[PDB]
Each structure stands twice: as C-alpha cells, then as structure tokens.
C-alpha cells in the first residue's frame, strides 16, 4: 500500500501523464486518491491528430493512466518514506 502512499504526497507538483490512449496530459496535481484517481489544474493536453487543449482543471481515473512523468527536481529518496 506503499507506492500509492508516495503518490499521494505529490500535490502542488506538476507532471505529465500518458493516458492509455497515448494522450499526454501536462498539469499540476491538486490531489491523488487511494486508487490513483488524479485531479489536476492548469492543464495542457497534447493529442495525436489535433491541436492541444488548455483547461482550468481536469480529473483522470487511476485506471486510465499508463504512467506519471515526474519532475526531475522531485526528491525521491526523501519521499520514499
């Protein structure tokens, strides 16, 4: 239950998320629940065959995510405790 515990520490961090459909969603995490559902604000979505999309906020189901790209400055060793 320990990795998701780490995920939930990641508020006010900005990230890019690859969705299962390949969409790249860049945004700043306002919150992550226990099943990886994620809420974001200040969002920029890059999609395969079309122009990008800004949005004030957006929430994504944990189960639509492939992975989170995390800021290079994120201190992993700290946050993994």
């Amino acid at each position: 239950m320990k990795l998701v515990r780490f995920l939930m520490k990641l508020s006010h961090e900005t990230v890019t998320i690859e969705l299962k459909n390949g969409t790249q969603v860049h945004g700043t995490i306002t919150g992550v629940d226990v099943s990886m559902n994620t809420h974001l604000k200040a969002v920029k979505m890059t999609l395969k065959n079309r122009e990008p999309v800004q949005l004030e906020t957006l929430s994504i189901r944990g189960n639509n995510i492939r992975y989170f790209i995390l800021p290079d400055s994120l201190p992993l060793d700290t946050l993994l405790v």
Binding site: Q24, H26, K44, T46, K48, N49, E51, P52, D72
Partner: protein, 215 residues
Amino acid sequence: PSVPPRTPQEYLRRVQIEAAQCPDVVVAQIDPKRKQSVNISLSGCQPAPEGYSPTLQWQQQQVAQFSTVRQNVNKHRSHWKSQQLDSNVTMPKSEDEEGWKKFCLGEQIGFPPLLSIVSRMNQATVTSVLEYLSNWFGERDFTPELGRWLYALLACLEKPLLPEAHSLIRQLARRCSEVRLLVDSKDDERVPALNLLICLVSRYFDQRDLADEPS
C-alpha cells in the same frame, strides 16, 4: 471431516485450510542457460571535442532566454496570424516534404521564419517540417538559415510533446553532436549553433541524457 463438501462455502473453506498448508512462495533451484535477443538502443550525443563543451552557466542562461522567447511567441500568436504577404508565400501543403525544403531553404533563396509565417503553423505541421529539416540536415551541410528555422520551429513546439516529437528532436540533437566532431576551429560558424540546439533539446525539452555536461 472425510466426506466430500456439500456447499461451495464448505469447499472454499477447505481449499483455504489447504492453502495455508502450502508454502506461500516457492523457489525451484534449477541447473544449467543460453544466448538472448539484443534490444537495439540509440546512441546518446557525442561529447564535444575538448574545449568545445559550453559551460553550465551558458547553457542555463540560454534556456532561460528561450523560455521568454516562447512566452512571447505564443503571447502574440493571434496578432501575426492575421496579416499576409503575397502569391509569394504559399505555405506548402502540410505533407509536401520537397516544397517545404524549397520553401524554407530554396536552392528561390528561401523564406526566413517570420512570426507572420510560423504563427500560422499548426502543431502537426511544425512537427512535420522539423522532420523535413532534420532529413535535409543529414544529407546537407548545416547553414545558418537552417539554424534559424530549427530554432524557430523549436520555439513553436508546445508542451507537453508527443513522444514522436521527443524522438525527433533527440535525433536532431544527435546529428548536431556528430557534425560537431567534424569541426576544427572554435572559430567555426556551426559551433555556437550546434551547441545551442543541443542545449535546448537536452535542457529545455527534458532529454537531459543528451546534455553536454562539462568536465
């Protein structure tokens, strides 16, 4: 006890008891082996010849500067969007490799990257064009006219980039590093520009495996 179970709850109750009987994880020691398929991976960038690697302080200042450029590009996109030029600027079809190369680079002499022209460029196009220019770059010398186009098209790519875009700009930065080896004075015209593009790709666009780390 020793008569078959007669409901599923009983059956399962019995499996569970039998589950604890078993060791929860098991490890068979084997004895030997073989060969395994290789996974081909692309090279990083070639380090600069000694003396040609720029300082971190230059690189960061360059990045910082590039960001502002991008702030301003997008900040005024719509003004430049509505202007024109002439029969002159026909922007090739988005998929005319050959005519984009002729458009931007010429043998006429080629149109430079005016905001008036690049602000009309949608994301898939900027991507495509960059590519066209990458290709042309593998098979021709780097001119300063090429530099501007690449820098411009880089100033118009919006984040978050799609993966193919990352792959593309990385290919370009590899190519810059390779050409950089051919050079023989610091005075060479290519040097500042090639270092610049490698920087923006490695530090502005997050590919820091490709960055010139001095020393």
